[PDB]
Symmetry: C3
Subunit: 650 residues, 3 copies
């Protein structure tokens, strides 16, 4: 089968294969995996465990696993994982040398030629977790590729107006280098197998998104994947907001996928002993929350790392969904309920389309690159540190999640700026500190054609060369109908108190003051102009150059950001989309459609039972899924702590 947007979603798990394991233990795993309503496994095709002393390939260890998978009707995601040190847990991200590249060619020839013949092979994973924060610039292969890339690019030290510039050669090379290696791996597989889906799992996306050109990857993939691990990738969130983290991670991959189907290649299946940055053992409740969040965001699968554990050194007896007796943990029991639900609701679950509110939260590579130059790699967890340009849009995302509104989370190049009408569409640019003339023209077009643009923090302070048009002649003056006057540093947390008394917005670190020309000024209680609304063609701009999303984050209170944002949304979004009648702290809802029927996903992450009033769209709430006996009266849902609910609208 070739995956499509109409495929039946699956629940699956990594089957960890290494020497020493017995036939009987491996059969025990596939048997329990099949009994757990899981259809799919993923296997790391370790070159180390196939290479013989003579340099031939012995496939025996993996044949045994593929044959047992086949016997239990389990399909396999096979990860290309060439020979590497036992201590290299995640795998090398690029060849070490030309000689190493040839060894990888030989690995792919042998492994793809052999395992392509199994009728239960579902997908090739080109590489595990492309991208690293520590790129191997010291190694000869990378050193040479970077030297060649620089020779083929012609950068000037000055812009057209004559101002000095940064060119971000390293960052632009790294995008092209990822594009090149993944495309090369896809071409290598395609030498031997044109039949099977090609897949890859970008990881740590709130940090590594600046490495990833998903639109290019679409050209050589059949599906986009992702590792979304609560213990590795969600450090910007408390555990009670891993719902929001998973929703944003799902939205980010969904945006990257474009017209391709996507699935989550890795979810955390088990316990951190010594591993992980933010260690946990997922609850049964978290397992259910993550699977539903992903399916509600169009995922065609959720694969857990891992069914069974590694036995030696790094992650030995960690991450596993099965216990040390090879029986179901409460996490596998939980995952099995979702597999069962899918088998009983195939037509619904196979045709999920996320109900787009029309709100898109946009991030760009360049804001992250400019931030890394300006903060000089500081990790003090504020606006003056690496991560503020992602924490800011994630904070708006959280505010909308706590309003029960869906929002896209997209790289700016993944947004379609080519349409003739953007009536009732919303773009949020939250502390996207780098914008160039081309994207500003796209934003002007978007707003002119009826779009609503919300911009906070230092959005557009710099261009793509770290040149500040705020200093030289502000590129967004036309769209904003206003001009920045000053930024003044304040405390980590201050209040922006609007003159009309309607709003007291938590704000982080810097207070922006502006001067309006065409825009309507918004004054604070100090008599300073802190924001404006510009009518621009059929659309509008709300600009508040203080970081109010980071303010919400620092105050741990998204309520004011919710209320303000709702007041700016086109009426059609609030009328046509199910959402909460007001802000609910630590509650999320996202809606989806399947074959003309609308559904809503609701999760309560508060310490108490909540009664959530759902308004907007049409229909009466029928509870289709609830793991703690939720009930609805009219469109008022009573939902318990850690409960996941699916409402079908009739």
């Amino acid at each position: 089968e070739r995956i499509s947007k109409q495929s039946t979603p699956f629940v699956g798990a990594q089957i960890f294969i290494e020497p020493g394991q017995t036939q009987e233990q491996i059969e025990q795993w596939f048997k329990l995996l099949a009994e757990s309503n899981m259809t799919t496994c993923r296997i790391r095709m370790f070159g180390k465990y196939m290479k013989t002393p003579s340099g031939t390939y012995d496939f025996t260890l993996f044949d045994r696993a593929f044959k047992l998978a086949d016997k239990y009707h389990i399909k396999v995601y096979a990860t290309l994982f060439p020979d590497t040190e036992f201590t290299d847990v995640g795998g090398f991200k690029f060849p070490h040398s030309r000689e190493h590249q040839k060894e990888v060619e030989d690995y792919i020839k042998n492994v793809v030629s052999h395992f392509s013949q199994y009728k239960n092979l579902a997908a090739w994973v080109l590489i595990n977790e492309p991208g690293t924060p520590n790129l191997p610039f010291n190694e000869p292969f990378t050193k040479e590729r970077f030297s060649d890339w620089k020779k083929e690019h012609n950068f000037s030290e000055y812009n057209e107006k004559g101002y000095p510039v940064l060119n971000f050669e390293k960052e632009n090379f790294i995008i092209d280098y990822h594009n090149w290696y993944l495309n090369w791996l896809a071409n290598q597989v395609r030498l031997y197998d044109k039949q099977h889906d090609l897949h890859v799992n970008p990881h740590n996306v709130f940090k590594l998104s600046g490495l990833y050109d998903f639109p290019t990857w679409r050209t050589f993939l059949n599906s986009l994947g992702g590792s979304a691990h609560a213990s590795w990738h969600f450090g910007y969130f408390p555990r009670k907001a891993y719902t929001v983290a998973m929703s944003a991670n799902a939205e980010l991959i969904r945006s990257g996928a474009g017209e391709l189907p996507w699935l989550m290649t890795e979810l955390q299946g088990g316990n951190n002993l010594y591993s992980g940055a933010n260690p946990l053992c997922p609850t049964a409740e978290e397992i259910i929350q993550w699977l539903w969040i992903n399916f509600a965001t169009e995922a065609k699968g959720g694969i857990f790392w891992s069914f069974n554990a590694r036995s030696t050194a790094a992650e030995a007896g960690e991450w596993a969904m099965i216990n040390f007796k090879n029986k179901s943990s409460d996490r596998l029991i939980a995952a099995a309920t979702i597999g069962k639900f899918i088998t009983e609701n195939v037509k619904m679950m196979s045709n999920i389309k996320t109900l787009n509110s029309g709100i898109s939260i946009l991030y760009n590579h360049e804001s992250m690159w400019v931030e890394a130059a300006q903060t000089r790699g500081k990790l003090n967890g504020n606006g003056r540190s690496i991560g503020a340009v992602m924490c800011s849009p994630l904070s708006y995302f959280e505010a909308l999640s706590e309003t029960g509104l869906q929002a896209n989370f997209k790289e700016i190049k993944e947004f379609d700026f080519s349409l003739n009408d953007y009536t009732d569409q919303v773009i949020i640019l939250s502390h996207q500190i780098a914008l160039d003339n081309k994207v500003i023209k796209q934003l002007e077009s978007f707003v002119e054609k009826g779009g609503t643009l919300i911009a906070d923090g230092l959005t557009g302070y710099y261009d793509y060369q770290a040149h500040s048009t705020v200093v030289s002649g502000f590129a967004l003056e036309n769209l904003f109908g206003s001009y920045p006057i000053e930024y003044k540093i304040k405390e980590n947390l201050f209040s922006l108190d609007f003159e009309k008394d309607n709003y007291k917005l938590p704000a982080h670190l810097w207070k922006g003051t502006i001067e309006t020309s065409k825009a309507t000024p918004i004054m604070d209680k100090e008599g300073e102009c802190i924001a404006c609304i510009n009518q621009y063609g059929k659309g509008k701009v709300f600009w508040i150059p203080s970081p109010i999303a980071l303010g919400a984050r620092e105050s741990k209170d998204f309520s004011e950001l919710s209320k303000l944002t709702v007041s700016l949304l086109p009426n059609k979004i609030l009328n046509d989309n199910p959402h909460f009648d007001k802000h609910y702290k630590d509650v999320m809802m996202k809606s989806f459609k399947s074959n003309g029927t609308m559904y809503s996903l609701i999760i309560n992450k508060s310490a108490s039972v909540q009664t959530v009033d759902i308004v907007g769209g049409k229909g009466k709430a029928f509870i289709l899924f609830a793991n703690k006996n939720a009930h609805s009266t009219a469109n008022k849902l009573t939902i318990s702590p850690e409960e996941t609910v699916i409402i079908k609208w009739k």
Copy 2:
């Protein structure tokens, strides 16, 4: 030459710091006050730098002057072999830099030992100051080559017998053999020129560096084992109010290493940290008394303070000294002098001390520390997921027992005698000893089968010596434990294990272990999960609780529940025959000893308040032999003041 033995009269002593610039008059002033302070012994760093002449010959003058003044005041000398090194190298190099350097060290030893062996007041050669370091010189050619050779001579496979991947810990096993080799080589060099004098060495920072030290091997070339036990360097795992427990554990660890050899504490902190030390202090007079008694009660044949007098330049200039800047007694030297005086007035008692072994042994192994260093990737976040949990865990059990007034051994697993036919009324505690191999598991099976009680908490036995988890592949301790692990689930740094029927609410650290029993009796918590078991195995028993409850005690700063639970598991004979407290006392310690058939107890109060301690077990009525704040007993109820040290003689 007088040879140290287990019957030697213990001494109080001090480093005499000799460097150029000192006058005859000031050095005589030191030896005179040292003798007047009831100290019999000094230690002198025999700096190669201060004997080498421009021509490369040896001029012994500076050290002759010190040895002759020591001799005049009847002071014996521990002479530390300390070849030429940079002025800024405070502690000394731990291995030769190069083959050429090794030959310079040979020449140093020839000259210094040939000359100073002739002094009748020479008591011992200290082969090297403070063997071992956290920063081992793998960068240097001598070490790099020895390591390459060692690896070639060892036959390591990347897979175990069952076929699983393994780690072989080549570096760690090499470092053990490398220390064994260099110290044995230094002993052989000294013995070329002097067969008469005791050979001694002072391992240091033992709660961190014990993984470098093979004490059973060192016994083959030593006459005595030493130690540096400095409150400002080595006790970072403890608050200052528990430096009693730290010193007791450090003494027990060296005593275990010593085996049949006598041991003494080569360095104790004698004075103030100005700029030096990790956990700086100036010991109180009360701490000086506490440390000397703890060491003597743990069979120490000496306590030598670093230092009598101070260095004058740069590192530790005017620091560490027992004398003040006028070269008169601080309250620390006055305090040490009372203990020297006590020894001279109680020779027969103080010369024949044997620690009263409760029969409780807390065991650590090199391999748990090595596997921890691989799994934590050197993280220093002070939890179970950091370097040091495998030592902090057993030290926490040690503290819980100290606060119950029970002695406990603190031993490397190879220092425990597993060869006996009977272990009735013996107890082994394996607290978060995360690495155990098949050989040690068979020894533990034998120990328990023959009547031993085994207490195991935290991740004990989660890995083998190759960092392979038999918990994953087929649990090697299933037979002994009569049970099988089910899961670990990470929780907060501090949570409560609430036993069914409210029998116990145990503080626990970081991970909750659940198990399944076969032969063992399960113990359930209030959530209906199986969190522990008792297995009857031959004549003995196993108590297994795979959650870290010793680290739980540490994190909660409360050892009371760990005390109560441990007491409930002890053979009756231990509680009947050993003096101990009738209940747990926070910040109080007691350890008992015997001399010539008479039993004694050492009690120290580290709480902020006067404590009334009810002592039970063993036989006899309290006679207070030593009490520096006028402690009094009513029956066997001891009223002891804050910071007081008490010795009871049981009549």
Copy 3:
């Protein structure tokens, strides 16, 4: 000198002080925006600008010099009658914000020679050129010992010095070769830059701006720099250099930074080359945007401390990467922020009070707080570079004297802040003079003989913390034979480490002193002992010739710092001052937390500067000296009744005494 001077202004101690600003020139700026800057700068009562003469923005592909970009700026400055401080800033990476501190190589040195030849030969011809800044911000915490030029200079310096591993008595020593080389290396490079400029221009003032002075003072030999400078400068940035202080004490930080530069200047005039003019976005260690009130506070503090100028970094902002749209006094519309409006009031005040403002002499109380290079160097060796902000960390040797300085500021008393070599030990009379040596842990035999002479001739010496524990070779005479025994009439017994904050509980009168980290006990011979409640001797007063010594070897200045309370240190210090200081100097009748006063004289008239940094209106009773308070300057309507000044939060006041 007058024939050499030619048309060029020579700055002097009688010059009219100016307010000025950096004019940031880079390619891409338009003629129109640069003219807009000079026009607003002139309208803001500023007479002076400073310009970074970037080699990068003059070098052509062929290696010739194109001066066009800077010609445009100099001509627009000239049109608006603005004089220029021109900073020699050779070609360096765009990302090198502050500039290289030494040549990378012999080849680089030749490139610098060529840069200086071209730039000085050309811009010396502008009649509005006021000064050459030889280098921006000499000194760095990261000295380039890795680079071949520095490596070779260090090797040569070591060969030309003869150090023994042992002192005369035979004790081991440290020689601090690196630190002594670094002093001589700064002396050499700055002197070499001055010589290079003087090849082509003998007419214009030579200037330099040492920076981060509470950390980098150990790099700086100001007495030597005097031999090739016409004025000493300084960068004193609230966001970079004042980390040892909370923001509410940046008054004290600026006063101390001004005193430190004033001491370095000796007979030369000084001015503050950089003050923070605007906002930190991503830049700075302690980021802020100065208030209008802070701008006024800083200018008056500097002028009251004899500054002949205050130049703000920056009038306009950089446009790209580091500090893009940061530091600027103008807003993004190129109009006045409240900071430029504030600075303009001070420029206006100067124009209306030329004779007063041109002749300021600080009213020296006779209190000198002394620091030495060697205490900082010995501290760096003993703390092994630890940064835990206590006595056992880098910085205690400067935080201690700064704490005494703050105590005196909060008593309304002026105090000098001087390197020990900047103190004149040559006089016959030191009656009514006071030296404070606060945790100056390194003193040599030569300085001890100077201190003995100072006290014998009527000087009062106050010494706390580990003052004199070590000599200049990190050898402790406390261990070998205490070199200060004669002067102190006493001998140290012990140090015992305690908590970060403990109390010294005196025997008498239930008196208490906050103390930091270590308790010092002593034994008196000639001195009168002071005992604590434990019957230990914790301090003494030695009567020595006509003078006296107060010694308390516990850190009580650092105790005041840790407790955030300088009241007891104020009271104790006042009780030790010669009566003549309290009789002749305006000061507060008692300690005032978060208030400062410093007094100055101009043409025989006395003035006082008062700043309130408390959250509340304060009524400050001023006593000492003569005259009735007339309020000459007040930005929040201060009023005086007799000599009782009512001053509002963040207000700056100048009193003229009648």
